Nucleic acid binder design. Structure first.
Ligand SMILES: [Mg+2]
Ligand SMILES: [Mg+2]
Ligand SMILES: [Mg+2]
Ligand SMILES: [Mg+2]
Ligand SMILES: [Mg+2]
Ligand SMILES: [Mg+2]
Ligand SMILES: [Mg+2]
Ligand SMILES: [Mg+2]
Ligand SMILES: [Mg+2]
Ligand SMILES: [Mg+2]
Ligand SMILES: [Mg+2]
Ligand SMILES: [Mg+2]
Ligand SMILES: [Mg+2]
Ligand SMILES: [Mg+2]
Ligand SMILES: [Mg+2]
Ligand SMILES: [Mg+2]
Ligand SMILES: [Mg+2]
Ligand SMILES: [Mg+2]
Ligand SMILES: [Mg+2]
Ligand SMILES: [Mg+2]
Ligand SMILES: [Mg+2]
Ligand SMILES: [Mg+2]
Ligand SMILES: [Mg+2]
Ligand SMILES: [Mg+2]
Ligand SMILES: [Mg+2]
Ligand SMILES: [Mg+2]
Ligand SMILES: [Mg+2]
Ligand SMILES: [Mg+2]
Ligand SMILES: [Mg+2]
Ligand SMILES: [Mg+2]
Ligand SMILES: [Mg+2]
Ligand SMILES: [Mg+2]
Ligand SMILES: [Mg+2]
Ligand SMILES: [Mg+2]
Ligand SMILES: [Mg+2]
Ligand SMILES: [Mg+2]
Ligand SMILES: [Mg+2]
Ligand SMILES: [Mg+2]
Ligand SMILES: [Mg+2]
Ligand SMILES: [Mg+2]
Ligand SMILES: [Mg+2]
Ligand SMILES: [Mg+2]
Ligand SMILES: [Mg+2]
Ligand SMILES: [Mg+2]
Ligand SMILES: [Mg+2]
Ligand SMILES: [Mg+2]
Ligand SMILES: [Mg+2]
Ligand SMILES: [Mg+2]
Ligand SMILES: [Mg+2]
Ligand SMILES: [Mg+2]
Ligand SMILES: [Mg+2]
Ligand SMILES: [Mg+2]
Ligand SMILES: [Mg+2]
Ligand SMILES: [Mg+2]
Ligand SMILES: [Mg+2]
Ligand SMILES: [Mg+2]
Ligand SMILES: [Mg+2]
Ligand SMILES: [Mg+2]
Ligand SMILES: [Mg+2]
Ligand SMILES: [Mg+2]
Ligand SMILES: [Mg+2]
Ligand SMILES: [Mg+2]
Ligand SMILES: [Mg+2]
Ligand SMILES: [Mg+2]
Ligand SMILES: [Mg+2]
Ligand SMILES: [Mg+2]
Ligand SMILES: [Mg+2]
Ligand SMILES: [Mg+2]
Ligand SMILES: [Mg+2]
Ligand SMILES: [Mg+2]
Ligand SMILES: [Mg+2]
Ligand SMILES: [Mg+2]
Ligand SMILES: [Mg+2]
Ligand SMILES: [Mg+2]
Ligand SMILES: [Mg+2]
Ligand SMILES: [Mg+2]
Ligand SMILES: [Mg+2]
Ligand SMILES: [Mg+2]
Ligand SMILES: [Mg+2]
Ligand SMILES: [Mg+2]
Ligand SMILES: [Mg+2]
Ligand SMILES: [Mg+2]
Ligand SMILES: [Mg+2]
Ligand SMILES: [Mg+2]
Ligand SMILES: [Mg+2]
Ligand SMILES: [Mg+2]
Ligand SMILES: [Mg+2]
Ligand SMILES: [Mg+2]
Ligand SMILES: [Mg+2]
Ligand SMILES: [Mg+2]
Lengths: 137, 117, 52, 112, 101
RNA sequence: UCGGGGCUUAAGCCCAGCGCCGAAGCUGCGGGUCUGGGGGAUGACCCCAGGCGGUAGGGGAGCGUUCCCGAUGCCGAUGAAG
RNA sequence: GGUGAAAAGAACCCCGGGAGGGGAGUGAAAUAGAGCCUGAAACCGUGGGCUUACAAGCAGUCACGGCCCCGCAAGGGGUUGU
């Protein structure tokens, strides 16, 4: 009968964002958010590392993107569809662009959100120097 | 000779109603609703029974692949090494060794890296 | 009957949930100074009277 | 111990009186008499009626101390409804249930 | 020490003194059968070739039995098709004793 | 809004290679039933090979309900039916 | 259409205007109390165990996990978080 892990401790990680290609980084970030790298992986628990990102304001992204490529929010009201280009996202709160990527990469369930909270993204550098600052690339 | 219904109907009913204990609302009180639900239930079980295997095969893979990843190679190549090295032993389930008794998993990694080339 | 009608018998759960706020509150009472008895505040009550 | 008292066939809807009963469940006999003494519902009269009888039974039959007993539990049950025909428009007609209640109140000694 | 052993088309990790339910074997209800099938150990037997040529695991057939019944309900809509089969899978319990190899 | 996120010496397109994932298909292990074929003199039973999605519909084998013979019987207050 | 073998149909006391109850008493039984044998289901309610207020649902099913409960015990029952 297959092994079930018990209450273990979350491994807090720290990733430097600047230079990294947006989507490419998000993918790995997501994987870390779930277990999926720890061989005691369990799909219904929440055991992914606490990823911390810094210098997110400096994420690289190929092609025209920034100019083109737009994020759309929808208010409930008529015409309530807002459209905001990648450019202006970074202009203001930029950690958004990475978050909206990692979030869209997490499973959509009630667990998915638990995990989305373990992801801490900052304009960086610097952040809550709690405990582990295990540089990672 | 007249054969009333009598016990017969009630009894066949109570049976199903037993099977439905625990279901939401009318679904565990009404015989007609109960049967209908059971119909669905039985079919689900039979199909989840088929899936259950297909489910663990997957779980194992990830756990194996996770251990292979930290051990240098990936799952794809790992299996190949093993499949080539004749070590048909490790059924993807028993590759739970990755979780406990890692030195054995490790031993099994080199055997695969050996069979590579 | 004519025009609008309920599309479905409301469930046991839905009914009672609606009746969430049905529970009435107990009366508010205070002991009058004259007797040890209980009376609703700001009200003269028989079996006692008043100080004019 | 505990003292029971039941008034059956009370000509009033259960759902209605039930509102009053829930008001005094667990309460002490003292605050209870008061809660009904000043509750603004028809059910009061009936629930009080059975509550006071429960008391009498408690003491005159079980040596229980009046000034020491509470409402260990109480509940109201539905009795056989009186169905009546209500003439309606365009000749249609329908029955209206003048429902009915079974009010039980069971008292009990405070502590020991 | 560990011991990966296959039987009844399936494999199991096994310690001595372990009780284990397995695909019904043909054996005296209280006899002794060693699973001439084996892979791995507590100190890495590691079966290069499929099996570990020269090794075995002694086990005492503790008894035979039948599993809890499972209702396999089949049902199709629009076409009044329903089937109810009761299924209890036969099995034999083993007691693992030696792991000599 | 390409299913989404997201992707630009690609996560796009084309050419070549190796490996892996994967369905109730196939394999293994156990069980069931049908048919054919083998021993069993034997009824029993075992062995081997193969078949078993299904509506209209045809065929086969059963389960339960009331009543009758079995009843001047047997069970039943140490408790019938329900 | 049905109390019970028999009315033995509940004196008397207690709460209540009464109804209806609580004691007492009858009976094998009163969960046989009078529309009274057995008393199924829908339906209504009281108590208790598990559970639920960031979550999108033919209401189940598969897995794991927690709480509660029956065998101190390897087991099983209830519940439902993911
Ligand atoms: Mg990856
Ligand atoms: Mg987004
Ligand atoms: Mg998921
Ligand atoms: Mg989905
Ligand atoms: Mg959502
Ligand atoms: Mg009929
Ligand atoms: Mg219900
Ligand atoms: Mg019900
Ligand atoms: Mg597989
Ligand atoms: Mg309710
Ligand atoms: Mg309720
Ligand atoms: Mg009356
Ligand atoms: Mg209450
Ligand atoms: Mg009254
Ligand atoms: Mg009295
Ligand atoms: Mg008494
Ligand atoms: Mg109530
Ligand atoms: Mg009625
Ligand atoms: Mg009118
Ligand atoms: Mg009308
Ligand atoms: Mg009408
Ligand atoms: Mg009505
Ligand atoms: Mg169908
Ligand atoms: Mg149909
Ligand atoms: Mg249909
Ligand atoms: Mg059809
Ligand atoms: Mg059928
Ligand atoms: Mg895509
Ligand atoms: Mg994504
Ligand atoms: Mg791109
Ligand atoms: Mg070409
Ligand atoms: Mg070419
Ligand atoms: Mg070529
Ligand atoms: Mg080619
Ligand atoms: Mg290939
Ligand atoms: Mg493959
Ligand atoms: Mg696939
Ligand atoms: Mg299959
Ligand atoms: Mg198969
Ligand atoms: Mg077979
Ligand atoms: Mg066969
Ligand atoms: Mg069959
Ligand atoms: Mg055939
Ligand atoms: Mg034959
Ligand atoms: Mg033959
Ligand atoms: Mg023959
Ligand atoms: Mg023979
Ligand atoms: Mg012969
Ligand atoms: Mg013959
Ligand atoms: Mg066959
Ligand atoms: Mg079919
Ligand atoms: Mg017959
Ligand atoms: Mg019949
Ligand atoms: Mg007859
Ligand atoms: Mg006779
Ligand atoms: Mg005679
Ligand atoms: Mg008998
Ligand atoms: Mg007797
Ligand atoms: Mg008996
Ligand atoms: Mg008895
Ligand atoms: Mg009986
Ligand atoms: Mg008589
Ligand atoms: Mg009389
Ligand atoms: Mg009396
Ligand atoms: Mg008295
Ligand atoms: Mg009096
Ligand atoms: Mg009156
Ligand atoms: Mg009286
Ligand atoms: Mg007494
Ligand atoms: Mg009495
Ligand atoms: Mg009874
Ligand atoms: Mg009882
Ligand atoms: Mg009479
Ligand atoms: Mg009468
Ligand atoms: Mg009556
Ligand atoms: Mg009843
Ligand atoms: Mg009744
Ligand atoms: Mg009932
Ligand atoms: Mg209920
Ligand atoms: Mg309840
Ligand atoms: Mg409740
Ligand atoms: Mg309990
Ligand atoms: Mg939110
Ligand atoms: Mg469905
Ligand atoms: Mg479990
Ligand atoms: Mg559990
Ligand atoms: Mg505890
Ligand atoms: Mg406890
Ligand atoms: Mg359980
Ligand atoms: Mg569930």
């Amino acid at each position: 009968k297959t092994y079930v892990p018990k209450q273990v401790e979350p491994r807090w990680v720290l990733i430097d964002a600047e230079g990294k290609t947006l989507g490419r980084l998000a993918t790995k970030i997501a994987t870390l958010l779930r277990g999926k790298h720890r061989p005691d992986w369990t799909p219904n628990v929440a055991m992914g590392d606490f990823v911390v990102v810094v210098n997110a304001d400096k994420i690289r992204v190929t092609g025209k993107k920034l100019e083109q490529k737009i994020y759309t929010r929808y208010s409930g009201y008529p015409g309530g569809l807002k459209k905001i280009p990648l450019e202006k996202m970074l202009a203001t709160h930029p950690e958004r662009v990475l978050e909206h990527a990692v979030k869209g990469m997490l499973p959509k369930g009630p667990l998915g959100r638990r995990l989305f909270k373990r992801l801490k993204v900052y304009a960086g550098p610097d952040h809550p120097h709690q405990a582990q600052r295990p540089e990672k690339l | 000779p007249r054969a009333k219904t009598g016990v017969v109907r009630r009894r066949k009913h109570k049976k199903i109603l037993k099977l439905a204990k625990g279901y939401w609302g009318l679904r565990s009180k009404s015989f007609r609703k109960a049967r209908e639900t059971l119909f669905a239930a039985g079919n689900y079980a039979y199909a989840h029974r088929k899936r259950r295997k297909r489910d663990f095969r997957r779980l194992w893979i990830v756990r194996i692949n996770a251990a292979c990843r930290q051990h240098g190679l990936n799952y794809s190549t790992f299996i190949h090494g093993l499949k080539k090295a004749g070590i048909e032993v490790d059924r993807k389930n028993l590759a739970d060794l990755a979780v406990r008794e890692p030195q054995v998993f490790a031993e099994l990694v080199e055997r695969a890296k050996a069979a590579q080339g | 009957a004519k025009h609008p009608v309920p599309k479905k018998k409301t469930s046991k759960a839905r009914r009672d949930a609606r009746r969430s706020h049905h529970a009435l509150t107990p009366p508010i009472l205070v002991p009058c100074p004259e007797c040890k008895a209980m009376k609703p505040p700001h009200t003269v009550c028989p079996e006692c009277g008043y100080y004019a | 111990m505990e003292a029971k008292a039941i008034a059956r066939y009370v000509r009033i809807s259960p759902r209605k009186v039930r509102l009053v009963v829930d008001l005094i469940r667990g309460k002490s006999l003292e605050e209870a008499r008061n809660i009904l003494r000043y509750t603004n519902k028809r059910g009061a009269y009936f629930v009080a009626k059975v509550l006071e009888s429960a008391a009498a039974n408690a003491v005159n039959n079980h040596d229980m101390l009046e000034d020491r007993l509470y409402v260990k539990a109480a509940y109201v049950d539905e009795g056989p409804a009186l169905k009546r025909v209500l003439p309606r428009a365009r000749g249609r007609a329908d029955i209206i249930k003048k429902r009915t209640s079974h009010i039980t109140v069971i008292l009990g000694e405070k502590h020991g | 020490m560990f011991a990966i052993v296959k039987t009844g088309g399936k494999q199991y990790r096994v310690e001595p003194g372990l009780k284990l339910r397995v695909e019904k074997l043909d054996a005296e209800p209280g006899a002794t059968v060693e699973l001439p099938v084996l892979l791995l150990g507590g100190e890495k037997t590691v079966v290069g070739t499929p099996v570990v040529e020269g090794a075995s695991v002694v086990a005492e057939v503790l008894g035979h039995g039948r599993g809890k019944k499972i209702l396999v309900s089949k049902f199709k809509a629009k076409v009044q098709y329903r089937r109810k089969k009761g299924h209890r899978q036969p099995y034999t319990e083993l007691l693992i004793k030696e792991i000599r190899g």
